[PDB]
Symmetry: C3
């Protein structure tokens, strides 16, 4: 009786009202494109004073729902295919030419051995390798990071979503928005929530991380765009909701393999027409854009069905009162 009343207020309140069992349900199809904007300034020894724009710091220039911003670098310039001393390690160091077998090439060595034992320094000797030479120096990445200015960059996240079942199509560039707004706006929770242009700093900040620490060794940042919509409500809700979360760094007590980095090169022909190359070991933050969402709308079918499934339990309450 109070059991009846409980499970009857349950198959209406819980499952019909609260769990939206009067609704058909579809899940989102999404597409995103991104654009980063900004300049960073570096002074190092020696490129002189250097500026990095979007075509300098986004590697590759286009990905599907992901973007990588360069933050720190170690740059080795004027490399050519030639011979040089390996960088000194237990594995590399040597006393005589005998220590170095010609042709020996192991995954963690600087190249293919000549092999000759040659001076790496005044003090140390090392196997001579055929490689892109000079080798990249062995150093920690700059702190503060070279590309620190990246914190002030902005990224337009453009997102088209569709809900096939409902013939529903929307963009995260909302109808109350227009071109001029995008000429100025930068997303803020308080004053500009509808601006789909985010300061990178703000993204990692809102995830409770510090851009200028992260930009040293790099990392991975998630951007979740959630479109959860009641289409029984007007089409004016069904707006996306952004949340930001740092994706790497699972056991932060660890100094083991921190951050994100990769090597890439730029190639040139010099005077003689022999390839010379610039190698960059870049650190940066990969930004993963992930889109989710579910749209309900009223249909009688799952309502009836859910009610039918509801009475089956609601009566079996009073049935199991006796049936034990």
């Amino acid at each position: 009786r109070f059991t009846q009343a409980l499970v009857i207020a349950y198959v209406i309140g819980y499952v019909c009202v609260y769990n939206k069992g009067y609704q058909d349900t579809d899940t989102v199809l999404s597409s995103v494109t991104t654009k980063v904007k900004g300049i960073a300034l570096t002074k190092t020894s020696e490129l002189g004073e250097r500026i990095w724009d979007v075509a300098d710091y986004i590697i590759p220039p286009q990905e599907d729902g992901s973007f990588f911003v360069l933050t720190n670098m170690i740059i080795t310039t004027n490399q050519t295919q030639s011979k040089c001393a390996e960088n000194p390690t237990p594995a590399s160091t040597c006393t005589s030419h005998r220590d170095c077998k010609r042709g020996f090439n192991d995954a963690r060595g600087d190249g293919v051995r000549t092999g000759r034992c040659v001076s790496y320094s005044a003090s140390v000797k090392t196997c001579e390798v055929l490689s892109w030479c000079p080798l990249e120096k062995i150093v920690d990445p700059p702190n503060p990071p070279l590309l620190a200015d990246a914190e002030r960059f902005t990224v337009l996240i453009k997102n088209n979503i569709r809900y096939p079942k409902f013939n529903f199509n929307k963009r995260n560039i909302l109808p109350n928005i227009n071109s001029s707004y995008l000429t100025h706006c930068v997303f803020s929770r308080k004053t500009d929530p509808d601006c789909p242009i985010f300061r990178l700093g703000d993204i990692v900040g809102e995830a409770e991380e510090d851009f200028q620490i992260m930009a040293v060794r790099g990392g991975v940042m998630g951007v979740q765009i959630r479109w959860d919509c009641d289409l029984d409500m007007p089409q004016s809700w069904c707006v996306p909701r952004y949340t930001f979360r740092r994706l790497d760094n699972k056991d932060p007590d660890n100094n083991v393999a921190p951050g994100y980095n990769f090597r890439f090169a730029k190639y040139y022909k010099n005077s003689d027409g022999t390839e010379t190359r610039t190698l960059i070991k870049g650190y940066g933050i990969r930004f993963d854009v992930m889109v989710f969402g579910q749209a309900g709308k009223f249909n009688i079918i799952p309502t009836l069905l859910n009610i039918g499934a509801g009475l089956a339990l609601l009566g079996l309450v009073n049935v199991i009162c006796d049936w034990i």
Copy 2:
């Protein structure tokens, strides 16, 4: 009685026959690779007459189940790290050197201020910035699009699918197909449905869009490959089905942030051995290849189970006739 007959013809006709409840069900594992083929010809002022092949128009040259074809460009050549006037805006324009604070660098400005107010034109003056100079001119992208010839390009979409539960493996390159066929064929609904090489024009066309309009500002095109298979039927069905849909452009009344474009650069060392750079703001169509599918096959287990679940409702019909 007619209620019985109705819900009994239901647990056979609806759920056992029509809804394939006699079947185990697995979902597809897929892998795709793509290849674009074609040349486009441009004449502009002034590169001279120029040809663009696959290595020119596909950025980057390889992605996982996505490919981007360049369609329109704005090209700024001979850039060097140097000083120049910002492009004139409310934000950039100035009267005195005082208007420009040295070092000021905002995300939407052309570079880092010197700062000096310098002539942009006869009429206007603008903050001098340290940047890649000259700056990209401010213009609309060419209509007709530079790379219009891209409409005639072809793309081989190669797709390997597998169904783990059924030990089932197939390719969208069908057994009735062979090498010569691929030497000539281009996919058509009527004469060549089994040719997995598609004219780009035909893809966007079949989605009811116009290539030569889209190629102006760019866009995103979906290609859905659906493998839905009854493996009780011979392995000769279980063929993929292609449908094409334009992914961006949710509220087409909008002039706000239309299409798809990105900036990318090519780098050179000049005589003096100082980096000079070509910058392209490219527009194009990203093609997203999306693969789905479900394979059923006969198993007794879910058949029995579904029947058992069927009688429970079929009898409870006659039970709720009285039980109200």
Copy 3:
């Protein structure tokens, strides 16, 4: 009675114990980054002796949960925008200048026709096209593959997973691992299962494929990282499990469109400051990193619920004994 005992030992043994119906269930959120390491050596006619490092063989240098390693190439150097004979085909060959309509450009031709019929050889004549010239020669890719040394490369697969429902975060770089270990280790089943650095050779090998065959025409390799965890057990299990599978090559009887390859270019300005280009048709193996997993943990709610659903069937056994 033995029916009762059977279906009661079933709703405990099968569904409560074996199917873990006492458990809440969440599925994995994952992020991966990768790093390839190694040098390959080539001798060909004629680049001289050549070394390929990570920045040479990984195209593009960064992808999201995928990496492509170059294995074989066909390299055409010193290309310029200029006129040359098309490569001889039924489509290309000709007798008179009339055979070649100026401006004719079809997707499978080498360029835009001048059109002039010009000597391709002593024996054959072919339409002159405006193209990047000389054209890439028509040949099979080298066997053995140029980049065979790639078999010995290593790849660090770094994987961060999270389970939102359980506030659970882990990395595939396990707590019992540290920096030095990564300085030396290479994953083996027997001696080094916890080393997340894999020899490429071993990956394709363990999938029962032969690296030096695959590296000729290229291919697609899957790497599945499965995190399936009982969090009722200590956090010390909940380790990932790696399995490797070749993704392409569905109907291996086929010589039709085998492997994986793409064209890409490197651009240079020569003396005169006219663009010259190197074109590579590269073959290689794309490595797809795919992460899955499910975590259960004890909650009373689905336990009670499952038991309630269990008695409904357990009694209806004895009910349908009579009710037929």
